[PDB]
Amino acid sequence: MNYNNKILVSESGLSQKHLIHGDEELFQHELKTIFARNWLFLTHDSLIPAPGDYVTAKMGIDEVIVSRQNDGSIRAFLNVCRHRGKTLVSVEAGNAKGFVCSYHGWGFGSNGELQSVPFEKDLYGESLNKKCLGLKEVARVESFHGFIYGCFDQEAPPLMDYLGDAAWYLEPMFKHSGGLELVGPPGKVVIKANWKAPAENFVGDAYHVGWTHASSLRSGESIFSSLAGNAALPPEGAGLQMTSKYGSGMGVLWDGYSGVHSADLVPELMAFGGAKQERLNKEIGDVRARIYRSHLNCTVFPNNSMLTCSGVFKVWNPIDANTTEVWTYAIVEKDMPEDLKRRLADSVQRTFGPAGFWESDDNDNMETASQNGKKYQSRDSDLLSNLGFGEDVYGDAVYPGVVGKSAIGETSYRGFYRAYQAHVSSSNWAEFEHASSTWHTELTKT
Amino acid sequence: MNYNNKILVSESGLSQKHLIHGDEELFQHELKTIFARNWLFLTHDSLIPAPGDYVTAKMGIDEVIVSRQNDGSIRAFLNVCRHRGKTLVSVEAGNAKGFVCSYHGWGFGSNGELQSVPFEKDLYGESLNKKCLGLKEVARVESFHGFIYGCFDQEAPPLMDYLGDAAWYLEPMFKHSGGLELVGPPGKVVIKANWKAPAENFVGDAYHVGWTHASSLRSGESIFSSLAGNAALPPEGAGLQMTSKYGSGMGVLWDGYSGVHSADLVPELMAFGGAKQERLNKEIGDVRARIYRSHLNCTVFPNNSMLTCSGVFKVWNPIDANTTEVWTYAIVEKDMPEDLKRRLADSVQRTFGPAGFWESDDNDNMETASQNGKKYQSRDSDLLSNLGFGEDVYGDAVYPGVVGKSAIGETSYRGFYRAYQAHVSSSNWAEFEHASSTWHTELTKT
Amino acid sequence: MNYNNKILVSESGLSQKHLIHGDEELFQHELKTIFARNWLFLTHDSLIPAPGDYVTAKMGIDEVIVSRQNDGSIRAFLNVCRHRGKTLVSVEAGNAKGFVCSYHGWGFGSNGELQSVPFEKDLYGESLNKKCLGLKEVARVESFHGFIYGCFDQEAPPLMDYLGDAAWYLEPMFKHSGGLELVGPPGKVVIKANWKAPAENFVGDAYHVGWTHASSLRSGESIFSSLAGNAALPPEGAGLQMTSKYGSGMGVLWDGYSGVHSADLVPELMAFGGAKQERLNKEIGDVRARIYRSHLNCTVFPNNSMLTCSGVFKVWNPIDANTTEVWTYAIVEKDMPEDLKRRLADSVQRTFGPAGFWESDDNDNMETASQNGKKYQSRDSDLLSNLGFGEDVYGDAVYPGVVGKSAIGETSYRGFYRAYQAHVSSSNWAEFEHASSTWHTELTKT
Amino acid sequence: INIQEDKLVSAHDAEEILRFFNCHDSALQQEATTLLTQEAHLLDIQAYRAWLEHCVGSEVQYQVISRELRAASERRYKLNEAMNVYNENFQQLKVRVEHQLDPQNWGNSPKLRFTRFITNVQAAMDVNDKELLHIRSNVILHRARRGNQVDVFYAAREDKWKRGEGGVRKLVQRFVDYPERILQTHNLMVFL
Amino acid sequence: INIQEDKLVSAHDAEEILRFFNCHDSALQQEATTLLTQEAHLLDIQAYRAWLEHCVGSEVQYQVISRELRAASERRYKLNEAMNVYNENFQQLKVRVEHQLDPQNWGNSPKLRFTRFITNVQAAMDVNDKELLHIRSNVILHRARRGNQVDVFYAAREDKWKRGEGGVRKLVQRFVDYPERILQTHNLMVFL
Amino acid sequence: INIQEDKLVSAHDAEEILRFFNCHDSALQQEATTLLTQEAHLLDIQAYRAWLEHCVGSEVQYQVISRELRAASERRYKLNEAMNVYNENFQQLKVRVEHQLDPQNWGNSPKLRFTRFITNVQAAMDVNDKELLHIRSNVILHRARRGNQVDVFYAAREDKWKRGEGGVRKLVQRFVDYPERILQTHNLMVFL
């Protein structure tokens, strides 16, 4: 396939070829133009707080070691020995000053440097240039309020710029709340779906909630439970949708601070969020204090998603076009009482974890939609994302980004897929920028 | 591979490159030039007799919903939602006026029309053109005496014309018997064989029966049991072989009405078939009445096979070059007593079903022959189908088609593979016709 | 990928692209330029000593029947019926005058000839040219002191010439000892590694032993046990490394006749080898008699490896780029007492067999190094094999081949991969020769 | 069980539960365990004639069904719900046994390897037939052949066993509703 | 066990061993076997309400963890070692049961098929609470759905059971440390 | 069994059947069950030293073979029919245990997870040695490691156990004929 010319996403993001969820050649091409190019979630400060703390993480199909340095910074390296290519670290987390390869015993520092080679003097003499044999380092590692992302491409925008108009929506919870902690370890489950299926669903898909999650809504207690079985449409002004230049986007459901949590947590949460919002009104203004305690379903392009307030934090780690390894963490506000944090963490896994009953509702939807993209009569068919098209705005006085001022629509899909197409057809960041110089105009047509 | 030029099947169908059973690129190419182009078995009237009755079926690797309409016709649609591509129906059979998608709740009629969209007014207003969002319909759906076939290619010949000279042989059992019923549900088993391996075997392969099925012949009771272990060659005039322009073909074993059925059914069957034949002599003549109660091993090109009288009905559903999902139904004559129908149905599954002891004899043969087509030293080797070449006729006064007047030969292989090669090297039906304008001459050379 | 131009192995074999262990297109290309071109291990005289004895073996991904003929020679044929391609022999070893196909009963001689066809007269008449329908024969089959190798390429060098400078090192054990026997049947285990990972390790990798095998060294009793955990570097002059034109190579660890065997066998072995060495001094000279009772870790290019004295004999049978079927036999000296042979055979499997505790140490190393070759950021990375470069010699007065006069180095890797690259970039043996006319100069640079 | 409240439970399944909850006899469970372990052992070593002679009653019905996938809410479509993978009387089982033992059964060379794991045994005498023993058990059946072919089968068995020739308890009915609709084991040519 | 000598054994595992080696009562093992076989039968037929009513105590903790992979030598890194796949009280289990039974649980049509294999049962009364029964058992759980989806789960269960309403022994704690870190079963939406 | 009639049955297998059909003792079967459940528990928690001390006799032969695939009709070719995956005396088992416990066994970090399922237990005292207990049992052995590596082993075990130090019954012979010829489990580095 010629990715320079092939129209995989139609103008304004209105539709996508179904093959995008099934084609293995395109998957391989995404490794280069999506995963090697963009910012990918690695870990949180709360998981590697002390010098020498590390975790392993995926970045696309590559595995990296992410390590807290002595000077307080974080550096990340390919989890691959520079000698004959053995995987260096076989655990998920720990504390160490270095990593020794189990094949021939080469020892690398927490800073990636080749520090020792067994019997170096007797074997290599002075001929081994260790200075050139450090672990292959992730070029870029930046933090968004403790949330650590990596990027293999030195030319990428800073993380903050990459978040674009989405950052404004995240900041009340991520910054003005006093900060969040990630509660590990994550659940890990493989699903037979393309990474884009859950990514698109979290970025933008309020429409599915009442029908897909009818049983979980009904059984499960929660604040958004009037939607079960499409029994009720949220009122006008119940929320909005947004998207951004570099593909990140989210839904906003006003006031839904207890999120998917069952009624056992609703009173406590609604009290806690309301109290904090009252203090925040004075600091960041009423609208942004309200956003803090509003439910955001967001995808940070390409493959990191979250539900704020619910506290669900996801990584859709790609394996192949119909295989994704789903990592699920809980996010909590640092200043919550510890007992609430514990219960909130358990509730995140209860609803959206490996045995998450809500998450289970989504399985067939994601898996069959993905697998159907391989089927001959569907490859060249058009997946539709036109709901709300021609009603989006840009440059609003209150809410930034391309915004649909309705709770349910496909605004965020359109922005996600506009960014996706611009990347897949571009060889580098310069070309993406050139392909994106009228991004918001394209999204608000008609 | 250049399918326009590559000789995969030699002149007169005398041989085929072994790679045809292993090459995944060719498999992908077959999806287009075999499965998307030709007539494929879907179901029988007896399985969806009433309005609203439906079943799911495969057509190549695609899945379709096949539904009895209010007006008595049958329409078939891709089992894929027109919104974001989720599989619409997750069951194998039922009765409904429509199908609702479990993702966002879009509701489609039994006629494929997009009938409802949740909260359409509030969400889409008048902007959603539902008329253009009906399920993707199978262009062609026709019946051969209750047996329903589909074809994605609007340019295909009518089903009757497609059956060509094979129809004359099938009609005594399919039409003049009073009609057949398909007894469901089918057995379903995955085998590690290419779909062509069982297809070729059923179309044309009497040679294997005595040796492959030695143990089943010996143990199992049946009428054809003198063949066990090649102990005896059928007498001259025991049968014939035929093939046709569009690739369908069969063997005829004269008088073998009890087929593979064990001696527990032989007396009853031979009585029933003989009685009907006596009545049919007056209506369709002695030869055709005899054909009615003769055992036909037939493949309806590409991947539907049957053994009449035995009552075995097969679909070789393709998955990849070395994977096939085998569907097994029983066929019975409508006017048989119900108790006989029940026992015949059980006997079909007993011999050729998921635990079919005859069918099991064929497994290693089909699987290894297929897998060997992937092996480096065998890809470019020649599978032989020359038995009886130079003794076939065309335009016989009694028996139509290209015919070998012997029970055991490779006539039907040659016609199957001549049709296969003409399709694989052609872009459309016109080109196939052009490639087939001397089909019978090619088959009767020397 | 353009294999004529792509530099997969750098000059002097100093490095290799990590993708060589993961790329499936390259694997397919190796089937042609490595496996179809070179000499591959089949069996030993001791396993098919009598007329009619046969075994099956892999040659690349192809399977062959290897059969002792009436005249005492050995011939090998594709295990594929010449009719419709069914696998002829389903067992691993036996004695027969011929092989009958289970599909249609065609009977082939032990000499590959099509000897019978069921009902040939009645069916084929005189039209079947059986003389042209013999099994596809392996063009070349030669013996190295009872060890039988095959090659599909008629243009290959004789086996002896192909062994090049490696033959001189093998001869004391393989010839002057009185001869070896292979003790079957082999263990068979699938590992998720590329065939080159164990191949390179056995050809050349003494460096890993102390660290990789620390636990087996420590627990397991053996003569080389001072190395455990890199506690001790072997003394200078403890051994050497060699390599050869056609890619075969080995390490020599002086005097290590008890090899990996636990202390339960050390006294007996060291006595037996020493006694034989004393007799051999007079016949082949002190250096070669010493080589006889020295531990050789060798790979006979491409995929046959061994540890002499330890008695470990391996075939790394390729399945795909990250799958290899490991066959493990024991080699014993014919004139050892039978009870010692039995115990030695058990000890080989104990250490290096399917539950071989030493072999298990290598698993993650081989598997992860191989799988990492698929990972996007590693494909174009460089696997290093530069240890000892610039200290190798050629044409030494005592030790032939390209030789590093040290126990631990990467000399044999460089020669292995120089041969590999010359094959992968060549269309035939003539081109390999042209690409190899300065092989030893390339390896001894600087 | 109340199947109006326990909405996922079939009438048939609720009936079978009742039978075992009712009157537990530990000695019967232990007898049943012995019976089934011995049966599995005979089958595993491919002593098919011994299995027929020692374990299978002359009036046996040996039945394994495959049930068509239908909607949980389905209430109109009423055609044959299942097909019979096996539905064998004694003579039919004998045919299958002879097929296994025939020296021209090419698929049986090299010899197959079977290993059965029988668990969850429950036993209860029939209420109305004092000599009819109901036995329930689950089986994992592992079949290995030809170097690298491995097939694993999983099933619940509803058996009736009754004392026959020589007072030996023999199988008079086995019913299995096979849990996987599309077999991924090449075939179902194993005695569950 | 001496865990200083048996270097791979956890303190927790050594404690649990001690409990069963101590005082074997064959009748208790047989009672435990019955209890667990009946529980598995109810779960297998998807009688989830019956399972709650008959097998699950009002004070239950039902817990399945996933433990982060750490170095065998690790001694410094001290953050949360595990997460809870399940950590359910009775009300939370009830929510899950209602979710299973809800007629708009689309994933339950066509109906799922479960088969459980319970083995390695050990039983011991608590030393200090005469009415608390410790039961250990292993489960293989086979779930089949949608023609060709097959998921097999493997686990050891550490249970506490105690007599409740009507003198019926009910589950008051189940602890499972799930052995596979990355699930390859689509989800863990099964009651182990 | 008559192996002339039951053509697929080996002489060895027919001999072993006879041993258990002969004289059933329910108490012995229950003792055997306890023995094996406890052994499996020790192995599962990787208490390898405890397993040696408590379960393995000083005169043990611990043997697992792999049999070459030969024609069912083969009668001429007479070379070694099998190789020994394991054929261990006590000292050799100890070597293997030390290898497991060694802190530089890199493959054991992160720690492996084992779960064993023991079924189909039969027990019979030897006819001629009153103190030798024959025990047959089948095992499914699940090993999980490194996030997504899962290996499942299936086998029938023919054991001899005899009372040793302190009157404790210990394993004196285990024989396993491994049913899969080509292992698809990376290795067989598990104690079956």
Ligand SMILES: c1ccc2cc3ccccc3cc2c1
């Ligand atoms: C995408 C994925 C999951 C979601 C879950 C939600 C739960 C409650 C309210 C709104 C939600 C929106 C969602 C959007």
Ligand SMILES: c1ccc2cc3ccccc3cc2c1
């Ligand atoms: C192909 C496949 C199966 C067949 C089965 C047969 C059974 C009895 C008689 C003739 C047959 C021919 C057959 C041809």
Ligand SMILES: c1ccc2cc3ccccc3cc2c1
């Ligand atoms: C490669 C693979 C295995 C080896 C095993 C060895 C055992 C003892 C001494 C030297 C060895 C060298 C080896 C080299």
Ligand code: FES
């Ligand atoms: S591969 Fe890591 S030290 Fe050699």
Ligand code: FES
């Ligand atoms: S995918 Fe079917 S309604 Fe959205």
Ligand code: FES
């Ligand atoms: S395939 Fe071998 S005889 Fe036909």
Ligand SMILES: [Fe+3]
């Ligand atoms: Fe959802």
Ligand SMILES: [Fe+3]
């Ligand atoms: Fe057949």
Ligand SMILES: [Fe+3]
């Ligand atoms: Fe090694």
